[PDB]
């Protein structure tokens, strides 16, 4: 205590690491988030790990559905 | 309510909807609902029989956006106001 | 706008594509639907793909009536 | 409620319930509930493998053309959306 | 009809087959159920199946009492 | 409210809870909520100071019990009551 | 008894093992949580990321193992 | 002795079990066979097992006549 | 040679060739060779997916009861083994 | 009948579909074959298929000349 | 010719035939051919509708044997004679 | 004896041999036997002093050729000849 | 040269390691072998490696079909 | 040309890479071989078993790569 969402809002307009479901994880600027853990990121960089590999994709604005967010790492 | 209202403002701008299965779907956001089910017009699969698509929310992974579409100052002011009302 | 449901209403009696979970897609006439996206189709043609040790094979089954549970619908598309 | 009500009428007809895991099961629809949990009487599966079926498992229920008033069903859903 | 819950209450204190999600199936006396399909069994026999290399092997596990969470229930059969 | 009320009387007894992924987990039942989430004490996560564990309901497959812990006569009367409420 | 959430309150700041949906399982000190089962861990290690602060979504926690 | 072929000859017109590659087994009347173990069966009942993401399911197909290629036969067994 | 000879007689009847990879293919048996490579005319597969078929790919060929003299076929194999 | 080799010689210098083992299929002009079904093609178009996540994606590869070893040939179709 | 003749001498002794798919098959060796296709009588699957089995050679992985069934001195004298004839 | 005779005239030419497992192997053809086993020189096992390689026929899927290396008029006359031998 | 089979017969009545198809491999006394690489072993010990593990099985006399032998290691 | 087997004779005692059916691939000095494509390698390493002598069955060799 108090609210774990309050510990998130401290990271608004700030760079955050987020691991998603599977071998993909992106980092960017935390613009918005809600109860369900939907987020909006600025200038994000997503990575995909493969063994069968460092694939990177760039975007300036992205909405991520909460259903896929598992882990929010504070730098 | 946040992301519902956020998406309502994004009606008529072209988006790119990443589905959990990797497919791309690029189109004009026409309608939205609470569960974030999306309705797109003039769709095209980037890159290599249109015409509309109702996308069930639970499928979306990403919706890609244009910086200029969004008022970043107002977005995080809304989530600041959202987190407070408890 | 409004509701993605209202725009789905306009396709009643009309030919419609549906994608389900996995490589399973089908096209019926739109007969019915609810807010859970449970739908009923008429004269519908299902097309499925599956592999049996690197063995893609297509199948086509065509029923005259079908009820599909909503929790299995991903996309509802509408042809030209 | 529309679909519940729709199935309530189908009681007594043979319906073929495709389960999400490819299994068939054809039988006489004896009862249904709000969650579309179906109780079918008789069998059997084609071609080898009286049951209560958790609705959360059904992919399809195959119907015949003349079990359904395709016009009253269409209008039925038209009334559904209206009530919003 | 009526409610499938009432079609299940006719089987309290009586023997009942339940098919869990996956190639497992348990059989036992029906002691309790609810709206979510949470069932509680007595003197139950779970029996799981499994292939491997061209094998229909079976394995049984028994217990005097067991609670089954709805989620995993897919079919419930009763003999006659 | 039946199985919530059932697990409530079951408090302080030793139980075994088989998870959906085949973990066994054998411990002393202390708590239960409406969602049937569980807390166990003095456990042995079979196999390989613990000491306690919190299990969300969505994970459990079985909860194994002993015959004497349950009044089968009144339990099945309790299910009879709740199904009458229509 | 009573509320399982109220027995988590009597467990704050302590070192807690939590399991996730999938192969990953990480351990850290329980700083805060809510009714949505969202948990925040301080000084956390994956069992290797040595995270400062970590927000864990509520629908993804399957087990919360705690030494006592 | 002699030849495992000669002892297979004695089962002509007679009910016979055959196991094929994988969980695929069938029982016909023995109609024909050669040194490559190509056989023909009559009134035969195939029983197959297969999994669809930990989902064992049995199937039974019964044809009236069938030619099986030898390169696919593992075992030929004979009931009591 | 027995089975070659057996198929030589089946020429002109519809035979259903189950391929080792589950695929069906029904057609009119037009020709066959020593290795039981089959050339069927017409189609099609049930229920979606004129061909030469490498014999090394066929699991079954389904026949009908009255295409085959079950007695002369039995004696035919009886003559086969005898010639050893 | 006769020999299926003769049914193949009618297609020398002509366009021919060949299905290789696996979800690959090539099409081209039939320049040579033998008893083992070794075929040699000209101006050929190999086209492999593949799912993934609910995907019927195709990929083409062409060459002026190609020899295909029998082993991999499963079906040979010719248009009309 | 070696292993063909070797197996001919093993007719009537109980063996255990390991198939490439792991199944056991324990029975009385009655007949054998060049490709080492085996014929077994009085079969039993060790451990948890008999009656004969024709086993196609290409399936066998192991055939287990009794030391006393085999004259080890003669076996390797036969392969010594086998390798020489080239 | 056709494709043995065909690959014989193909000697000394640069070829590409696609294996069943998708390896490319591009080198100079030196040898071929009746079983259509191959030896190549100055190869580049694409991708990642070699120098030579021996491929058993059973492995090759394709052997890629150039149009000029083959007299298509006489090759198809050569297949015509061998099929006449019945 | 000469014959690789002659280099085998030197190992008769002697302990030999043989790797089969897959994660199984046994060692025992080489009693017999042929062209096709069929072998007979005395007092053999077979091992199966698993990760998901050291499973061992004992037998005094075993015939191994050549179709499964890949590798014959001389100690 | 000629016989591919005769060009292996002109390659005896040299260090040779050979590939097998499956993931395993090992390298050693080619001591002997026959018509059945059976090969024997001296001082062989798997690429780690450092085998003295090794008999390799003929139906299992897919590639014989040789430095020249």
3-class DSSP string for A28-58? EEEEEECCCCCEEEEEEEEEEECCCCEEEEE
DSSP state of J21: S
> How far apart are alpha carbons I51 and I41 in whole angstroms?
7
Least CB-CB distance to N65: which of L31, L53, L58? Answer: L53
Least CB-CB distance to N36: which of M8, M35, M71? Answer: M35
Technique used to solve these coordinates: X-ray
CB of C8 less than 8 A from some CB of B = yes
User: What does each C-alpha distance from G20 to A48, D44, F59, M10 come to in angstroms?
Assistant: 20, 41, 11, 58
What is the domain count for chain J? 1
DSSP conformation letters of L34-81: TT--EEEEEEE-S-----EEEE-GGGEEEEEE-GGG--HHHHHHHHHH
Beta carbons of C64 and D65 less than 8 Å apart: yes
Instruction: Chain M: list its partners (3+ Cβ pairs within 8 Å).
Output: K, N
Beta carbons of K30 and H73 less than 8 Å apart: no
Beta carbons of D22 and H58 less than 8 Å apart: no
Q: Which residues are H61's β-sheet partners? A: H46
Q: What is the CA radius of gyration of chain G?
A: 11
> How far apart are alpha carbons A31 and B74 in whole angstroms?
10
Instruction: Chain E: list its partners (3+ Cβ pairs within 8 Å).
Output: D, F, H, K
By CA distance, what is E52's nearest residue in H?
H23
Residues of H in contact with E50 (CB under 8 A): 56
> How far apart are alpha carbons N56 and N46 in whole angstroms?
13
CB of J50 less than 8 A from some CB of C = yes
Which residue in this structure is represented by tokens 């009428």?
A: D9
At M4, list the tokens. 């690789």
By CA distance, what is N5's nearest residue in L?
L33
At K45, list the tokens. 């699957």
> How far apart are alpha carbons M60 and B68 in whole angstroms?
80
Note whether E47 and E60 are within 8 A (CB).
yes
> How far apart are alpha carbons C24 and M13 in whole angstroms?
62
CB burial of residue I72 (10 Å; 0-12, 13-18, 19+): exposed
By CA distance, what is A68's nearest residue in B?
B61
By CA distance, what is C51's nearest residue in J?
J51
DSSP state of E72: G
Min Cα–Cα distance to chain J from I28, Å = 12
> How far apart are alpha carbons D61 and C35 in whole angstroms?
18
Note whether D14 and D24 are within 8 A (CB).
no
Note whether M8 and M54 are within 8 A (CB).
no
Beta carbons of H52 and D22 less than 8 Å apart: yes
CB of A38 less than 8 A from some CB of B = yes
Instruction: Chain F: list its partners (3+ Cβ pairs within 8 Å).
Output: E, G
CB burial of residue H72 (10 Å; 0-12, 13-18, 19+): middle
> Resolution, rounded to a tenth of an Å?
3.2
DSSP conformation letters of N4-67: TTHHHHTTTTSEEEEEESSS-EEEEEEEEE-TT--EEEEEEEE---EEEEEEE-GGGEEEEEE-
DSSP conformation letters of I10-49: HTTSEEEEEETTS---EEEEEEE-TT--EEEES---SS--
Q: Which domain holds residue M45?
A: 1-75
At N26, list the tokens. 């090992």
Beta carbons of K72 and M5 less than 8 Å apart: no
Q: What is the CA radius of gyration of chain H?
A: 13
Which three-class secondary structure state does DSSP give residue I6? helix
CB of C2 less than 8 A from some CB of J = no
Beta carbons of M3 and K83 less than 8 Å apart: yes
> How far apart are alpha carbons D68 and D5 in whole angstroms?
12
Instruction: Chain H: list its partners (3+ Cβ pairs within 8 Å).
Output: D, E, I, K
Gap sites in chain L (C to N > 2.5 Å), preceding residue numbers: 48
CA-nearest of D55, B75, B61 to A46 is: B61
Note whether F28 and F40 are within 8 A (CB).
yes
Q: Which residues are C78's β-sheet partners? A: B52
CATH number, position A20: 2.30.30.100
Instruction: Chain C: list its partners (3+ Cβ pairs within 8 Å).
Output: B, D, I, J
Which residue in this structure is represented by tokens 């079976």?
A: E58
CB of J55 less than 8 A from some CB of C = yes
By CA distance, what is L20's nearest residue in N?
N62
Element (H, E) at K2: helix K2-9
Note whether G32 and A4 are within 8 A (CB).
yes
CB of E22 less than 8 A from some CB of D = no
CA-nearest of E21, D44, E48 to E76 is: E21
Least CB-CB distance to F58: which of E5, E33, E71? Answer: E71
Beta carbons of A59 and B64 less than 8 Å apart: yes
**Touch between chain L and chain C: 3 or more Cβ pairs under 8 Å:** no
Min Cα–Cα distance to chain E from K12, Å = 29
Task: Give me the helix-helix angle, L72-84 and L2-9, nearest 10°.
Answer: 160
At C13, list the tokens. 């009696």
Residue I71 backbone dihedrals phi, psi, to 5 degrees:
-80, -40
By CA distance, what is M67's nearest residue in K?
K58
> How far apart are alpha carbons F69 and F82 in whole angstroms?
21
Checking L39-46 for CB contacts under 8 A at 24+ apart, the result is: L39/N4, L39/N7, L40/L15, L41/N68, L45/N65
Note whether J33 and J8 are within 8 A (CB).
yes
CA-nearest of K74, K38, K57, K82 to M34 is: K82
At F44, list the tokens. 């042995």
Helix ranges (DSSP H) in F1-86 = 2-9, 72-84
> How far apart are alpha carbons E69 and F3 in whole angstroms?
10
By CA distance, what is B60's nearest residue in A?
A65
CA-nearest of I64, I62, I56 to I25 is: I62
Q: Which residues are M72's β-sheet partners? A: M18, N55
Beta carbons of J64 and L82 less than 8 Å apart: no
DSSP conformation letters of E14-59: SEEEEEESSSEEEEEEEEE--TT--EEEEEEEEEEEE-SSS--EEE
Which three-class secondary structure state does DSSP give residue D69? coil
DSSP state of H76: E
At N34, list the tokens. 């026959």
Which three-class secondary structure state does DSSP give residue C7? helix
> How far apart are alpha carbons J73 and J77 in whole angstroms?
11
Note whether J67 and J42 are within 8 A (CB).
no
Which residue in this structure is represented by tokens 């070893």?
A: J69
Length of chain D: 84
Beta carbons of K78 and M64 less than 8 Å apart: no
Classify the C-alpha dihedral K9-K12-K14-K17 as positive or negative: positive
> How far apart are alpha carbons G56 and G38 in whole angstroms?
6
At M17, list the tokens. 């390691």
At L82, list the tokens. 């061998």
Length of chain H: 80
Q: Which of I19, I57, I60 to mutate to test the interface with H (most CBs of H within 10 A)?
A: I60
Min Cα–Cα distance to chain J from L48, Å = 22
DSSP state of J12: B
Contacts with J42 (C-beta within 8 Å, 6 or more apart), sequence order: J28, J29, J31, J64, J65, J66, L67, L72
**Touch between chain B and chain N: 3 or more Cβ pairs under 8 Å:** no
**Touch between chain K and chain G: 3 or more Cβ pairs under 8 Å:** no
- In degrees, to the nearest 5, what angle opens at C-alpha G19 toward C-alphas G18 and G21? 145
Whether the upstream peptide bond of residue D12 has omega within 30° of 0, thus cis, is no
Residue J10 backbone dihedrals phi, psi, to 5 degrees:
-70, -5
User: What does each C-alpha distance from K7 to H36, K35, K37 come to in angstroms?
Assistant: 21, 11, 10
CATH number, position L35: 2.30.30.100
Beta carbons of K23 and E52 less than 8 Å apart: no
Min Cα–Cα distance to chain F from E54, Å = 24
CB of J54 less than 8 A from some CB of B = yes
Question: How many alpha carbons fall within 13 Å on the CB side of residue G44?
Answer: 29
User: What does each C-alpha distance from F33 to C22, F62, G6, G7, G30 come to in angstroms?
Assistant: 36, 17, 11, 12, 21
- Cβ atoms within 10 A of the Cβ of E60, count? 9
Q: Which residues are M63's β-sheet partners? A: K63, M40
CA-nearest of A6, H7, F77 to K41 is: H7
Beta carbons of D51 and E77 less than 8 Å apart: yes
Beta carbons of C3 and B54 less than 8 Å apart: no
Instruction: Chain L: list its partners (3+ Cβ pairs within 8 Å).
Output: J, N
CB of N14 less than 8 A from some CB of M = no
> How far apart are alpha carbons B53 and B63 in whole angstroms?
15
> How far apart are alpha carbons B58 and J75 in whole angstroms?
42
- Cβ atoms within 10 A of the Cβ of L85, count? 7
Q: Which residues are D62's β-sheet partners? A: C66, D16
> How far apart are alpha carbons G27 and G43 in whole angstroms?
9
CA-nearest of H55, E69, E78, E45 to D51 is: E78
- Cβ atoms within 10 A of the Cβ of M45, count? 13
Which three-class secondary structure state does DSSP give residue A6? helix
Which three-class secondary structure state does DSSP give residue F1? coil
B1-34 burial, b at 16+ Cβ within 10 Å, e below that, comes to: ebbeebbeebeeebbbbbbbbebebbbebbbbbe
User: What does each C-alpha distance from K78 to D36, M17, N36 come to in angstroms?
Assistant: 75, 22, 21
By CA distance, what is I19's nearest residue in J?
J74
Q: Which of A32, A37, A38 to mutate to test the interface with B (most CBs of B within 10 A)?
A: A32
By CA distance, what is C54's nearest residue in J?
J22
Which three-class secondary structure state does DSSP give residue I80? helix
**Touch between chain G and chain N: 3 or more Cβ pairs under 8 Å:** no
**Touch between chain M and chain D: 3 or more Cβ pairs under 8 Å:** no
Min Cα–Cα distance to chain B from J69, Å = 32
Q: Which residues of B touch J (CB under 8 A)?
A: 21-23
Task: Give me the helix-helix angle, D2-10 and D70-82, nearest 10°.
Answer: 160
What is the domain count for chain D? 1
CA-nearest of C42, C53, C49 to C11 is: C42
By CA distance, what is J59's nearest residue in B?
B48
Residues of I in contact with H6 (CB under 8 A): 81
Residue I81 backbone dihedrals phi, psi, to 5 degrees:
-65, -40
**Touch between chain F and chain C: 3 or more Cβ pairs under 8 Å:** no
- Cβ atoms within 10 A of the Cβ of M18, count? 23
- In degrees, to the nearest 5, what angle opens at C-alpha B59 toward C-alphas B57 and B61? 95
By CA distance, what is K19's nearest residue in E?
E53
């Amino acid at each position: 205590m108090e609210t774990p969402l309050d510990l998130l809002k401290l990271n608004l307009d700030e760079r955050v690491y987020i691991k998603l479901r599977g071998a993909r994880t992106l980092v960017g600027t935390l613009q918005a988030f809600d109860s369900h853990c939907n987020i909006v990121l600025s200038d994000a960089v997503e990575t995909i790990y493969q063994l069968n590999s460092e694939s990177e994709r760039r975007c300036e604005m992205v909405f991520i559905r909460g259903d896929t967010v598992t882990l929010i790492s504070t730098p | 309510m946040l992301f519902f209202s956020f998406f309502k403002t994004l009606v008529d701008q072209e988006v790119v909807v990443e589905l959990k299965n990797d497919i791309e779907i690029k189109g004009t956001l026409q309608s939205v609902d609470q569960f974030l089910n999306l309705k797109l017009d003039n769709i095209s699969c980037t890159d290599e029989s249109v015409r509309n698509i109702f996308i069930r929310g639970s499928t979306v992974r990403y919706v890609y956006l244009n910086k200029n579409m969004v008022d970043t100052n107002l977005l995080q002011d809304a989530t600041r106001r959202e987190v407070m009302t408890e």
